[PDB]
Design a protein around this ligand. Structure first.
Ligand SMILES: Nc1ncnc2c1ncn2[C@@H]1O[C@H](CSCC[C@H](N)C(=O)O)[C@@H](O)[C@H]1O
Ligand SMILES: [K+]
Ligand SMILES: [Mg+2]
Ligand SMILES: [Mg+2]
Ligand SMILES: [Mg+2]
Ligand SMILES: [Mg+2]
Ligand SMILES: [Mg+2]
Ligand SMILES: [Mg+2]
Ligand SMILES: [Mg+2]
Ligand SMILES: [Mg+2]
Ligand SMILES: [Mg+2]
Ligand SMILES: [Mg+2]
Lengths: 128, 300, 137, 85
RNA sequence: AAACUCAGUUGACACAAAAUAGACUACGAAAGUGGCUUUAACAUAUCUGAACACACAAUAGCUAAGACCCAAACUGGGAUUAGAUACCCCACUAUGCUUAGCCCUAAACCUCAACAGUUAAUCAACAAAACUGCUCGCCAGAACACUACGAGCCACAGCUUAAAACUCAAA
């Protein structure tokens, strides 16, 4: 739906601007979190921000924990900036899609080489 | 001819130019075009054999300047290939949609619910006897099929109710008359709801008008055949030729708009950016042509 | 001694030099990072324009202008033009909070020019013209 | 009308331009300039501003009280000295 | 997309608006009042006291004359729509400002009347713990009804006061 797409783009831009600043918290800015996309629920119940995860598992867990802690504060900041009148709760979802592409790149470097349907009923009724 | 002045001005008939009229019908637009330009070459195609005979008779006025042809949009390409113009090179194409004034005024054709007629509602006038009639359509299609057809073609919100009423009525007695079907459609709603629905003109209209429109479209397959006709007109039209399409309902207008806008580089140049509409006084004079929207383009 | 983030005071006996020049002599690089664009202009110490670049000038159009890559490309182009005019060290002053606010700088660094001081001059009306009403969607 | 390159100016240290930019951004955040810049993009109506300020004050007070309570009760979190009783 | 051929650095430049302080909780009868200076100035120590007068009363609005940054109903485009409106983008007006009058409405809400007193044996519930003394105003099922009529008003699609008949066993 067009409105959902526009809202997704606006929220993605706003969140990207938010995370490029120490505004939310110094630790979150130091984490230098990136986003791949932002998707809204069809019923506007929640806003899922898909953040890219690094290779380090412990660093990934730390970043996810900080994002979960600061999601409510970021929602309040978005509502304060009036980027959206009613902002649904923000859920930070890990994105491991790029890891699969990276591993494929690593391994490939060593890989070797309507009307007609009812017309039947109409025909049958005419014949019958 | 609805918006005859606009069509004449936009097409700009000129000497030695080739023009096609994919829907002759009454031929009022064709007659006006031949009136303005006495040296124009015109081919007029229609589905109604009555309209084909009318065009043949009117060919007495213009022996060779107008050439009549009988067939659908799908048959249009084959018939024009038989004529001998595969490139076409037509300097213009005119596509008037909807139901003919002669077809609707005649109760025998069954297009009018106001005057009782057989539930034919078939633009074909005996060329294809095996073609199903509206009575066959209503007596054949199931509840879900009829509801889907009504919802998609007549834009009827209450397609389920009308379909169920029609199914019950056909189960009781066969449905063969236009007034019978109109009474069945009215019975699905309270009697006060016979004229509750008001058109965009804010005048009371029969509640069975949408059902009749949907049934006519499904009988004649107007959407897909209009798509094929537009494609054939694009294929046959001369480069720089002028295509003028007249619509009477939202579905065909949407189809024409999407085809013109390609919804890839555009293959049309809109002569008029916004859709042209008849004068309000002209709308009052011709209530039937109120919903006639004009879309004009040049082949690119 | 030790490093000081505070810029050296004009008209003061500051021993710091850059290519033999004083801080008041180092050319300036203005970066206006608007919400959908990034315009970069290099001027001398005497406000003499030397290089100008922007996402539109680089060929990016519409939303492509409001991207960090476009800002980096504009920075690289402006840095190349300034280097062709003899610019090495620059004081960067940036206004606005556009997406390219940092990215342009990176491009301006990739062109070979050295940034000696990062300055913010974002227009902040203490309270001036009333801003537009909040968008509703 | 003020002198240039004094306000919101950070000198880069040995070329760590990224670090200098992060320091300047932290300074702007601490001084609240970023908040003002982003909140002045659109006009916040006075009633909305008052509601937001009251909510922020209440949230800050509640967070401080909760943190103080947690810190005060953290002393009890030692190992159990009376295990089995 | 439309439209501007303007955009950027620097300089000059308001009758508009009043970052941070303000995480303060002050002033005023309330409405309200958060840039700076100066002048004038914040009633009554004995309480209460207006359909019964005097004087106020945010925003919106009217009348007249100005001011033009920005904002902005309305309108005109741009997209979008089958088409049209709304939302989004652009331009722009009444209007927000000043002067001089009007209008006298707000969820004008701490939704908890003014004054005095008590913390003793708690209190339907929820809200802001429970009461006492005293005074003024107001209420007596819902709906009809921020209505009709009458009257008053600088008000003329207005405000204030404010019913009845029919109907319901609820609200
Ligand atoms: N797919 C199709 N192919 C050929 N003729 C068609 C057609 N669909 C409709 N027609 C015919 O074209 C007309 C459509 S409406 C009538 C318009 C006509 N120009 C007039 O003024 O009379 C009808 O006469 C109908 O019979
Ligand atoms: K101020
Ligand atoms: Mg008194
Ligand atoms: Mg009083
Ligand atoms: Mg007032
Ligand atoms: Mg006023
Ligand atoms: Mg404006
Ligand atoms: Mg108030
Ligand atoms: Mg009182
Ligand atoms: Mg009222
Ligand atoms: Mg009244
Ligand atoms: Mg009266």
């Amino acid at each position: 739906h067009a409105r959902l797409r526009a809202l997704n783009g606006l929220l993605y831009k706003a969140l990207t601007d938010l995370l490029c600043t120490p505004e939310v918290s110094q630790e979150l800015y130091d984490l230098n979190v990136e986003l791949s996309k932002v998707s809204l629920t069809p019923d506007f119940s929640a806003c899922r921000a898909y953040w890219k995860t690094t290779l380090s598992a412990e660093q990934n867990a730390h970043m996810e924990a900080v994002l979960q802690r600061s999601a409510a504060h970021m929602r309040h900041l978005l509502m304060s900036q009036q980027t959206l009148r009613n902002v649904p709760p923000i859920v930070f979802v890990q994105d491991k899609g790029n890891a699969a592409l990276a591993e494929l790149d690593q391994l490939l470097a060593v890989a070797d080489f309507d009307h007609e349907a009812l017309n039947k009923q109409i025909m049958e009724y005419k014949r019958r | 001819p609805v918006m005859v002045d606009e069509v004449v001005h936009c097409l700009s008939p000129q000497k030695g130019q080739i023009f096609l009229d994919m829907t002759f019908g009454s031929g009022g637009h064709t007659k006006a075009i031949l009136q303005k330009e006495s040296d124009i070459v015109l081919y007029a195609l229609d589905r109604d054999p009555t309209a084909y005979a009318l065009a043949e008779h009117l060919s007495e006025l213009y022996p060779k300047q107008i050439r009549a042809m009988l067939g659908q949009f799908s048959q249009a390409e084959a018939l024009l290939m038989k004529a001998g113009v595969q490139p076409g090179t037509f300097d213009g194409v005119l596509m008037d949609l909807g139901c003919s004034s002669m077809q609707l005024d005649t109760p025998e054709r069954g297009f009018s619910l106001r005057k009782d007629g057989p539930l034919d509602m078939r633009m074909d006038g005996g060329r294809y006897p095996d073609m199903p009639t509206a009575a066959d359509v209503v007596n054949a299609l199931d509840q879900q099929a009829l509801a889907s057809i009504l919802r998609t073609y007549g834009e009827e919100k209450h397609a389920k109710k009308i379909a169920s009423a029609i199914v019950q009525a056909r189960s009781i007695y066969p449905i063969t008359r236009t007034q019978q079907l109109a009474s069945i459609v009215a019975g699905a709603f309270p009697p006060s709801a016979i004229y509750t629905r008001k058109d965009l003109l804010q005048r009371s209209t029969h509640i069975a008008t949408k059902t009749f429109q949907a049934l006519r479209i499904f009988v004649n397959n107007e959407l897909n055949e209009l798509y094929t006709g537009l494609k054939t007109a694009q294929k046959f039209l001369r480069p720089g030729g002028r295509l003028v399409a007249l619509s009477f309902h939202s579905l065909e207008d949407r189809i024409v708009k999407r085809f013109l806008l390609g919804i890839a580089p555009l293959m049309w140049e809109l002569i008029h950016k916004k859709v042209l509409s008849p004068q309000d006084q002209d709308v009052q004079d011709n209530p039937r042509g109120r919903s006639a929207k004009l879309r004009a383009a040049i082949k690119l | 001694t030790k490093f000081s983030i505070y810029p050296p005071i004009p008209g003061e006996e500051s021993s710091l030099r850059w290519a033999g020049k004083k801080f008041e002599e180092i050319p300036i690089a203005h970066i206006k990072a608007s919400h959908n664009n990034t315009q970069i202009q290099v001027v001398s110490a005497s406000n003499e324009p030397l290089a100008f670049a922007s996402c539109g000038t680089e060929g990016f159009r519409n939303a492509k202008k409001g991207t960090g890559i476009a800002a980096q490309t504009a920075g690289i182009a402006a840095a190349a033009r300034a280097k062709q005019k003899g610019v090495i060290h620059i004081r960067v002053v940036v206004k606005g909070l556009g997406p390219g606010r940092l990215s342009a700088m990176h491009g301006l660094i990739m062109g070979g020019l050295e940034v000696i001081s990062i300055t913010d001059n974002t227009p902040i009306p203490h309270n001036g013209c009333r801003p537009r009403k909040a968008r509703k969607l | 009308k003020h002198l240039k390159f004094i306000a919101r100016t950070v000198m880069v240290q040995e070329g760590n331009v990224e670090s200098a930019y992060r320091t300047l951004n932290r300074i702007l955040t601490m001084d609240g300039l970023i908040e003002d810049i982003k909140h002045r993009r659109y006009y916040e109506k006075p009633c909305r501003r008052r509601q937001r300020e009251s909510y922020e004050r209440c949230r800050r007070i509640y967070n401080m009280e909760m943190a103080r309570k947690i810190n005060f009760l953290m002393r009890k979190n030692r190992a159990d000295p009376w295990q089995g009783c």
